[PDB]
Design a protein around this ligand. Sequence first.
Ligand SMILES: [Zn+2]
Lengths: 194, 283, 471, 176, 577
Amino acid sequence: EAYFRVESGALGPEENFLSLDDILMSHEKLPVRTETAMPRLGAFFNAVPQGSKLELPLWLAKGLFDNKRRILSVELPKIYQEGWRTVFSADPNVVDLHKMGPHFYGFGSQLLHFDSPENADISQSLLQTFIGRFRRIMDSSQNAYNEDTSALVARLDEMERGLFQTGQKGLNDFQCWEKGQASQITASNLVQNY
Amino acid sequence: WSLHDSLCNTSYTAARFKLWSVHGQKRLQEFLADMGLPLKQVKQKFQAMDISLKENLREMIEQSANKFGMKDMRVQTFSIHFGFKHKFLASDVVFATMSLMESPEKDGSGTDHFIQALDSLSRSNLDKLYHGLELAKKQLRATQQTIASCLCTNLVISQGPFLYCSLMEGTPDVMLFSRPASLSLLSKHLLKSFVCSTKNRRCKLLPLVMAAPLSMEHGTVTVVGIPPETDSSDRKNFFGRAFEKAAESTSSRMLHNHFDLSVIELKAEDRSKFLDALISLLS
Amino acid sequence: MLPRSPPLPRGNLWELREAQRDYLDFLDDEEDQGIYQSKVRELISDNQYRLIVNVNDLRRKNEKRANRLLNNAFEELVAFQRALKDFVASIDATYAKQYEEFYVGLEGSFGSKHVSPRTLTSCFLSCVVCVEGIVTKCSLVRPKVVRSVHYCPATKKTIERRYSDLTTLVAFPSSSVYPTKDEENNPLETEYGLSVYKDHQTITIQEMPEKAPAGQLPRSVDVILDDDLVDKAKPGDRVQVVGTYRCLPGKKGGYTSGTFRTVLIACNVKQMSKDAQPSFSAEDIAKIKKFSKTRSKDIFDQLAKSLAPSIHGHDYVKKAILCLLLGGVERDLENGSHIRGDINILLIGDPSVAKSQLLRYVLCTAPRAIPTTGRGSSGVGLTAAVTTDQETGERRLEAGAMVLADRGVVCIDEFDKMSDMDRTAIHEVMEQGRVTIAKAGIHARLNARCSVLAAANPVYGRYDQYKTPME
Amino acid sequence: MDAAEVEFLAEKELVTIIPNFSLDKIYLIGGDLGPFNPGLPVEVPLWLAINLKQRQKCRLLPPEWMDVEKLEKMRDHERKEETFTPMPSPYYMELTKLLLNHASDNIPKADEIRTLVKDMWDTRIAKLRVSADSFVRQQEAHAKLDNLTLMEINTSGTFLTQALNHMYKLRTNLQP
Amino acid sequence: ADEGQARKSQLQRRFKEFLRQYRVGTDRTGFTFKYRDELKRHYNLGEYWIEVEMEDLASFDEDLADYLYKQPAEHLQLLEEAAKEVADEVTRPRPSGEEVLQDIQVMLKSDASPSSIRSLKSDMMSHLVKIPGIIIAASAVRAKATRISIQCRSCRNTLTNIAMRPGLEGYALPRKCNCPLDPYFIMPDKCKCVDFQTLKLQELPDAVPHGEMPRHMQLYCDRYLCDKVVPGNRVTIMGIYSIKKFGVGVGIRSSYIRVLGIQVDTVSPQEEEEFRRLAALPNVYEVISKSIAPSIFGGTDMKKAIACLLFGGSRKRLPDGLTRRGDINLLMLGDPGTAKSQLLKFVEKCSPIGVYTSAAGLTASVMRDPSSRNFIMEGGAMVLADGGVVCIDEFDKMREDDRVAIHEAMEQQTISIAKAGITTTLNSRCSVLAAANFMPTILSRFDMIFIVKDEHNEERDVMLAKHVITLHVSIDLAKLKKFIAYCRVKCGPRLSAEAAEKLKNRYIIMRSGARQHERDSDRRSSIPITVRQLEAIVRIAEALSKMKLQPFATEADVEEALRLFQVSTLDAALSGT
Ligand SMILES: [Zn+2]
């Protein structure tokens, strides 16, 4: 109630520095093709050729990128390719955005700092998927009371679980006021140890 | 409860009907048949019984109990309604509270059950009352299975001026009555069944004295004393003096711990040393 | 894993007037990129009935119609197939009359319709669905009339008659009375040459084994193929049917039970598993003609080294297994003789020397390979066994293992736990190449030109290195 | 916010009680009260009427808008109109909870007032999730809520605003 | 006739005022409208069913809850038509995509004493009953036309909106078109349908009068009661005992129970921590292996090993799709002295999935069906155990064919029969815990052999006198199972670089002497090491290091596992010679 973690800026211009969600977000891998040799460090993948397909975290490919593609170029995973961008248009209420994740909107908004050609078509997928999956989170979260919700929440990602936990915290708080139950003073964080 | 499981357990029709001896269990059958109550509706819970039977139940039962020698069958009490389905008689609250405070399985100090029973008297806790009605049932079905023991085995000794009984640990559901407060009711129902059962004319007017083991480690039992039973008994007990003077004479180890005097804890070895001097003292 | 599209979306790179006038506008397709005017012509040059459509396109073109088509499939597919004949007459009216009626399949990505026979409830009635699963039977292809043509030898006229049953998209039960005297005066006579029949089958999809909750007997569903979709599925496959869902009522004696039977009137079929590799690039054939020329000295050894890297040692055995995977040349002389062109390999040795491994690799490498053991295989179940049918009750010859795997590979592991009376059933099918059966009411000769790869544990449990190779 | 503070803001509404004790004017930091003449009406803030009722020192009175007839017309007016219609008091839910729980015997026909209030509430909540779905569905940038009371706002606000922020972000991530 | 609808329009109004007005809770705390709120919260989620309770209905209006016990057929309709008029004034205005009001299947439960199947006398025909039992079968869901519409054939006259009656009763099509005699057919395009199953309920085992086979009854589930129970469940049905109307004796009918209420008899954040700390505590190993065999005592190795089989290694898919095992196999050789049957029963009881077998068989069979007169396929036990564990005793009693097939099934982990008309495959994913009493190859299909042994010294006899009363007298499983259920599904253990060079040098030196062992003595039978046994070692170390949620195994357990195996292979060494 007073532990206010630093929130995630993974949807705006640039992720926050201290947010433990973005730190684990950017760690996810991404495919690149190198433009030069990689001397003195070919141990991991001593030198590495130019024109080689490698898998690197996102944070690494932040500074190793330039406009001229001096060191390496990037190509998007298939989840954001043209293939799946039609699937997410058929009916977005069917996809398991936890397997295709578990950071869909967080990752996809950082792949816009690579000035690829099809950006005007990724920032339209996300917008049209989130709008598609809305009337199923506005209604399965404000209307699921004293139920086992661990199956209404099995196909969501970190940007959506944060909202499914705000619908419930406002349902279970009006239903606790209606029943004269939110008058008793209780232990706040000690019942967490118990 | 159902209408059947509450005739077999009220210690006022479980005495008259003698619902512990197969010879008189058919009396219950005849009583039910004289009213037109199917034996399949009487066995089902009362809230689910058909609506066409329960019209004048509380009259066709008072009537057909004259034909059997039970004329004090209607009493005067009160009842409360809260809402849509909440309907209590003032003698259901009592049997539920009295059994939340004296639950057998102990979960802490002596003042852990007291709190849970004080809780279940305010309307904001109908989940304890509605729970303390499943203990009060479990108790009442485990009392007619003890008064059925000491009357199909004749453990009521006629030790002279007063009857006498005792209990055995090996019998099931005898650790439930270990408390020195839930033992008075068992004895007071035992006397009511007995006085109706025996054929003598002397035993029908002698007070009872009962003992059941309290503590195996200290090796001690608990003892009570109840007035001579009758219909119009004045209810003026007299054992708080008898036990005192008897322990004084024998000079044994006793404890008058409670507030009422007629309940004592006694060494398992001073039983006879105490009892003989008491027999002589009451005379 | 959820198949939310017939084209695997991961690695694809490597009144009734509005509907009919909107479908036509969609089928114009010229002004944007000409995707379908490149397909109508394409099928006219191949003489096809139906064309496959992508609903993914219908969405981008017109969302309202794409939604109204996945929820009222009947009234929309009777307007699609009309405004398709209309658009084929707008190219070649001569062709547009060769065929009675056109058809239109579907494919793409339906939102919640991608269901299994276990999830196919009764909220999908009259709705395009896309069922996946295994075929576990087929029916006998039978004609079915859709039009008659009669004739009056007396009046020299010619009357027709149009038929319809409950397995149409319009569903009026017509009677097959075949009129013989329309007016009591003149007699009639049917003309079969000028009438119109069509094909008709009935298969049974069944839920995939590894998708069942394993507690029950997995659910099934009945499909009604038709009009040259007919033989497109054999027992034991993995299909993705895309067809309307329908309930067909009945009445036996003027009194109907409410219970109905629901079927799936298929209008496309897809084999999920790719079991062929003839799709090569010109860059690939370039690579191939390079590699075949680089060095003629060391290309065989270099081929065999890269055969099964997951195994150490056994270079000779890999060499020979490669020779198997290639094969010889089957010569058939002029008089009619025949000489086999296959290689049969046998591997014996102590336990745990990767024999089963080599077998399980040769299985997946070659196309059309069949596995088999030495105890789960009888002498007759390998080649061909006689049985009967349940519908007709007359005998036939079910093909054993070594006849399914024709022009293929058969992998027999623990070839030594096979009784003496069972090996003998192979001596004809391993050299002469064809099985001959003369049972009670069956006299047949099946072609079984295959190749055997077999593994056998030696006697004495381990190879006593002192006795002799023959003992 | 949270319901237990809307309930705090709602205990400032004025109601009318009938005391049965003698007391002279009191000068509260929020006004004046009294004098309390036994058997004579007086108007006080709720948080005092409730607290005096619990101590058996008064007898409440039903507010005028709390009539079983005018309410049976509000309940129909609400279902006819297609926008949020004006309501008797900005805090009617909390009034008809606190009153009817603590003074249900001084209010005639409590268990019909209660059902009509709940009928109104169950509609004004249905209009919200339609007015909060067209917003997203059409990607608006403004929405005029007409006569929403603070309680309806607070029951589904901390979700709606938090799910519109994540939409503004997704809609303005391509400009730079 | 005219008073019929006038009564109904007065019952459908008193069943509506019940849902609209019934409250709970007291006046001190605060109230709660019980059924409006559930109607709304179930409609907005898209469920369309409430669960009315009969005690409430009784306590509100006493007459209605009696009609509902006497004429349930023609009153459930009024109830379900008032639930639809209340769910309309509560959720409206529906937002955009739905504006047609659905239909609300009103279930109903109760708290009343259950009858039994043997107490269904014919005077209970069309009265709500309440019986317990056990589901024994389950049909496949089908359609059932509810609102049907017909059409003439010749003149093409329609007569639509006809409503079927519920239950198992058909409909009598007219014959007076107003055209030939019966000119009416059904229009398949216009007929609303709902699902329906058909179960089979057997009477509880402890209520058979014990001279015969238990009797059973037939049910009829509906829209939302379908696919709610699985053959093997305990239930409590509230149905309308009724008769089939599809119109041994002259006037005999069939009878079923139209179910309209069903019940079933029997993870957390804070529960996670009692798994966490227990996996983290220093002596995490022995605490389990101590509380997995209370009755039988002696030689905890035979209990050490069983601890791993409950967890198992992990399933890897190399790039080649060449998957690897994820289970283990165990053999307990030795005399049948009934000391092992106890252990089998325990491991079966405390398993997430498990079957103890001595019927159709273990593996699949091909049997000539009487009806079909043809061969059909019978998947036995090892196809029903998905990831579970199968226990076997008397490994020489099983049918010759069956033993061959179990050999192949433990070899490949799937069963593929190619016989008369059957060519299918069934993935066998289970664990074999075998007890012996034998080729060097079926023996080598396992990896761990435990034979039994004893002594007779008088201090040993003091140990025996101890063990006497340990049986003369005669960490919990209820949480052990729910611990494994979370441990198996959260750990991804592999080996660390050092375990590799440990195992290489252990295994090479295990091989290096088998030569001089078998080159001289060669007693016609022995057992050498094989790479399958090495892979068994690796998948044992995985299951050890999964006890601790430790994502990387090390030398912490490899040597003790190797010594466990030095026991398990020397056992078969002594037995086979
Ligand atoms: Zn007609």
